[PDB]
Short mmCIF file of C-alpha atoms in Angstrom, two decimals:
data_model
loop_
_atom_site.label_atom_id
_atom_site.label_comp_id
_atom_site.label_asym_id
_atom_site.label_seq_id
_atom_site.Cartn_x
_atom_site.Cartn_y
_atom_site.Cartn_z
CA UNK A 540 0.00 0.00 0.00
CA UNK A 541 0.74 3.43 0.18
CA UNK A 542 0.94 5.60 3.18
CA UNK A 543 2.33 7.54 6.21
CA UNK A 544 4.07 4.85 8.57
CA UNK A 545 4.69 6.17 12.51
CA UNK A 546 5.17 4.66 15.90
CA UNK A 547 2.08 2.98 17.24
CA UNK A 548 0.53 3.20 21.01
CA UNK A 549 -1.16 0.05 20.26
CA UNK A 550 -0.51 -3.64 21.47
CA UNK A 551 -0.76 -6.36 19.89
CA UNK A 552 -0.83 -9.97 19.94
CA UNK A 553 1.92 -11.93 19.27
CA UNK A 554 0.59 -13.62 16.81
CA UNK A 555 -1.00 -10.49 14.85
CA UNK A 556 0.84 -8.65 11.61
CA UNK A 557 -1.78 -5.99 11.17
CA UNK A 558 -4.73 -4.43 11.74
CA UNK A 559 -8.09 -3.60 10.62
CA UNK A 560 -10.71 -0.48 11.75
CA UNK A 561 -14.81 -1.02 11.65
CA UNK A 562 -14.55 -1.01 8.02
CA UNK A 563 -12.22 -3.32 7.41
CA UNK A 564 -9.53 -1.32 5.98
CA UNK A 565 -5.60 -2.03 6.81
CA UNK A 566 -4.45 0.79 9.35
CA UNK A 567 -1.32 -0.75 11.22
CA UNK A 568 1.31 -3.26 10.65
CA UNK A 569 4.12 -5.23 12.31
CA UNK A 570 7.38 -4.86 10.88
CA UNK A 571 8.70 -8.16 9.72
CA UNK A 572 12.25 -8.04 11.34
CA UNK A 573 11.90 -5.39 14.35
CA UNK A 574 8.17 -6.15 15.38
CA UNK A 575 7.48 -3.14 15.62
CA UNK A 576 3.55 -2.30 15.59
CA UNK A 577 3.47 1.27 13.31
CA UNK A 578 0.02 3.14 12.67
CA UNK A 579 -0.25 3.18 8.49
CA UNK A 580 -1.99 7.05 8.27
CA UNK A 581 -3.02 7.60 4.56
CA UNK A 582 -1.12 9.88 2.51
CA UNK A 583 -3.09 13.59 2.41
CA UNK A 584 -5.42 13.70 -0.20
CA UNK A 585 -8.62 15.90 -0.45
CA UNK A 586 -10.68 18.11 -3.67
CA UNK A 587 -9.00 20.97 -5.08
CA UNK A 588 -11.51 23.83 -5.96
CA UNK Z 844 -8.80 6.22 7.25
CA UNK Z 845 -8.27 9.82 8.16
CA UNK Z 846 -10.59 10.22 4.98
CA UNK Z 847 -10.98 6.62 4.21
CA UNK Z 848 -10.49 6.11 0.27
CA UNK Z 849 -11.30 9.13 -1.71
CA UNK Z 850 -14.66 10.39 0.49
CA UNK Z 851 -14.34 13.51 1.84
CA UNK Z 852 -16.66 15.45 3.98
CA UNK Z 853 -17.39 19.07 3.50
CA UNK Z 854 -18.33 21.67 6.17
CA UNK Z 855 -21.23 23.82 5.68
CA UNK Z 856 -21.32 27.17 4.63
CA UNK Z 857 -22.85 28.65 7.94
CA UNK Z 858 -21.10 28.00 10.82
CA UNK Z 859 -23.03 26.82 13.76
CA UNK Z 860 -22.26 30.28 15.84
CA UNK Z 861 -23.88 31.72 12.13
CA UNK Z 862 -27.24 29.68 12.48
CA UNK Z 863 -26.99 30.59 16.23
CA UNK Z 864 -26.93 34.47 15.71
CA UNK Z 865 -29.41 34.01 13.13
CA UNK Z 866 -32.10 32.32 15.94
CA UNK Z 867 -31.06 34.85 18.19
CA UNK Z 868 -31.82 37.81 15.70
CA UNK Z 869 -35.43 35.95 15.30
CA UNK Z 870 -35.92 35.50 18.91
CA UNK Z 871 -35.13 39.20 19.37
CA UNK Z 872 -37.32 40.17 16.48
CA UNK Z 873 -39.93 38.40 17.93
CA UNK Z 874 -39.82 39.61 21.38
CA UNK Z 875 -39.39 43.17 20.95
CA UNK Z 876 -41.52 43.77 17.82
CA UNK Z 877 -43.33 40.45 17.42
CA UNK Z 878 -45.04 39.62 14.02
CA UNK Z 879 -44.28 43.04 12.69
CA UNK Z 880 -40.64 42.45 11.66
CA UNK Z 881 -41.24 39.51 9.12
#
């Protein structure tokens, strides 16, 4: 994907890689080698008028 | 999801303090001159 990675405040389970809001869209990850849980924020977007 | 995928949301054009000073101009219309200011 594409996106805005930064340090997360949430815990996870062991076993989890990622996560998933109420509408089941990716939002954090575990990094493969570190295990680090980061926060994916999507990149700014918005209407231009 | 800040703005999940391409959806965005758009304010309104009058503010809520807007609408609010427009209720209190009626009220006030109404109490000091009642039905003669519409």
């Amino acid at each position: 994907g594409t996106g805005v990675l930064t340090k997360s405040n949430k815990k996870f389970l062991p076993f989890q890689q990622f996560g998933r809001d109420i509408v089941d869209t990716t939002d954090a990850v575990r990094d493969p080698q570190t295990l680090e849980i980061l926060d994916i924020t999507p990149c700014s977007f918005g209407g231009v008028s | 999801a800040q703005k999940f995928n391409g959806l965005t949301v758009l304010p309104p054009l009058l503010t809520d303090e807007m609408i609010a000073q427009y209720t209190s101009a009626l009220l006030a219309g109404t109490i000091t001159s009642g039905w003669t200011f519409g």
